[PDB]
């Protein structure tokens, strides 16, 4: 369809205001092609011409599916811009109209609806909730109520997974509980599909739903997804591992019972890889996740010890991107506050002291507190064995006492107080 390439807004306007369905169809397409263009589409001008309500109106024209499609795509691309732009689409009454198109017998039109609502719900909490109130969930889910997901078109299914992922998304407030209960079974099903794009976005959805209080985490863990998450944590595709790791990391911010499910599912065996992973953010989120495990019970710290992960933490503490080192410190401090003397001794035999001391050269004043708190905890463990002195010497060897003395004169008070305490108490 070559006539519609590169119109002006005023010509699009001329076309849409004729009482000629077909002229309106060409104009709309020309408008879509403007908004489809790669470089700075004139979203704000289309809005300013007053075209949205006309577009929305075109969504309702069952008798002329091509105009439905084109208005869909046009609106979809307006709703894909800024919040103001999405708002203009919502203010035209697009939501109920797009929901109405979900049952459309033309798959390509149904799919556009799905995409539009995706963009609308993705703006934030309010519009997400508004899409839900308008009743989008029953029709979205009905489009996936089939025996085998594999019969659906590749793109259609990716689109639906992505849109559902946006209905699970954002966090102030979290999505209505009943809407999450309604979505999860289908979501769980998608999380076992073999298309990596579907898996990524399922994992994102799960990561969003687990980003919150323990009750939210529980409704996800209840559905038995932890084993499948752990499996996905081992995928080759980074866009799957990334969200899978986030979900696991979220889940272990919850109760120790909830953490245990991930340990039971085999998670810890993947961490040697993750804690060494070349993508810096994976390494960061892996170490973060470790810290919320070392924050747990002693039998859970043992599982960390038995999987040979303490040396990996010593490793990350010794050399990693700084933000990861920071989580490494936390993971050690958590370990050290909740551990047994035997577990804290092991930590030192794995060589934690030297690299822990090297991080007191850091300019970040919060890390120094974490580290210093760890030291105290470790002394507290040597004080119960009579080997406080051996540790003191050990901290001399690597030049740690040198650094602690200089931190006795740090500006932050919580610092220089913890410093002073240590020097006098053990040196």
């Amino acid at each position: 369809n070559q006539g519609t390439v590169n119109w002006s807004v005023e010509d699009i306007v001329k076309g849409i205001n004729s009482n000629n369905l077909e002229s309106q169809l060409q104009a709309t397409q020309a408008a879509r092609k403007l908004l489809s263009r790669e470089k700075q589409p004139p979203i704000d001008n289309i809005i300013r011409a007053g075209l949205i309500p006309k577009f929305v109106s075109f969504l309702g024209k069952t008798d002329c599916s091509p105009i439905q499609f084109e208005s869909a795509w046009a609106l979809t691309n307006i709703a894909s811009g800024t919040s103001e732009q999405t708002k203009a689409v919502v203010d035209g009454g697009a939501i109920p109209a797009f929901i109405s198109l979900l049952a459309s017998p033309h798959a390509h039109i149904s799919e556009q609806a799905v995409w539009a609502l995706g963009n609308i719900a993705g703006d934030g909490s309010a519009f997400r909730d508004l899409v839900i109130k308008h009743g989008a969930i029953d029709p979205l889910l009905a489009l996936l109520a089939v025996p085998d997901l594999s019969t659906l078109a590749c793109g259609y299914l990716r689109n639906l997974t992505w849109t559902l992922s946006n209905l699970c998304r954002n966090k102030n407030p979290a999505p209505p509980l009943d809407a999450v209960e309604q979505i999860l079974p289908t979501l769980v099903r998608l999380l076992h599909h073999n298309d990596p794009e579907v898996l990524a976005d399922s994992c994102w959805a799960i990561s969003y739903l687990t980003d919150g209080p323990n009750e939210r985490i529980e409704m996800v863990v209840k559905k038995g997804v932890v084993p499948q998450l752990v499996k996905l944590l081992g995928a080759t595709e980074l866009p799957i591992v990334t969200p899978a790791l986030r979900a696991i990391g979220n889940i272990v911010t919850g109760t120790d019972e909830q953490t245990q499910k991930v340990i039971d599912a085999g998670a810890l065996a993947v961490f040697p890889s993750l804690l060494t992973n070349p993508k810096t953010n994976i390494q960061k989120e892996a170490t973060w996740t470790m810290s919320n495990i070392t924050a747990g019970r002693q039998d859970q710290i043992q599982q960390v010890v038995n999987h040979g992960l303490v040396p990996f933490l010593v490793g990350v503490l010794s050399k990693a991107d700084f933000k990861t080192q920071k989580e490494a410190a936390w993971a050690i401090t958590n370990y050290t506050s909740g551990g047994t003397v035997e577990q804290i001794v092991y930590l030192v035999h794995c060589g934690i002291i030297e690299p822990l001391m090297n991080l007191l050269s850091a300019k970040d004043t919060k890390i120094i507190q974490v580290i210093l708190d760890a030291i105290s905890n470790i002394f507290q463990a040597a004080e119960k064995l009579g080997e406080t002195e051996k540790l003191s010497i050990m901290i001399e060897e690597c030049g740690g006492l040198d650094k602690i003395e200089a931190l006795q004169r740090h500006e932050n008070e919580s610092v220089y107080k913890a410093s002073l305490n240590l020097i006098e108490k053990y040196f």
């Binding site: 092609k33 489809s36 263009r37 790669e38 795509w73 979809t76 691309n77 709703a79 894909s80 811009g81 999405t86 556009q112 995409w115 995706g118 963009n119 993705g122 703006d123 590749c154 793109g155 990716r158 992505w162 992922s165 946006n166 998304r169 990596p196 794009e197 990524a200 976005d201 994102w204 866009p239 969200p243």
Partner: peptide
């Protein structure tokens, strides 16, 4: 067919 959404809030439909 590739096309990873990454975690994107909004998706523009290209021509």
């Amino acid at each position: 067919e590739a096309g990873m959404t990454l975690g994107a809030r909004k998706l523009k439909k290209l021509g």
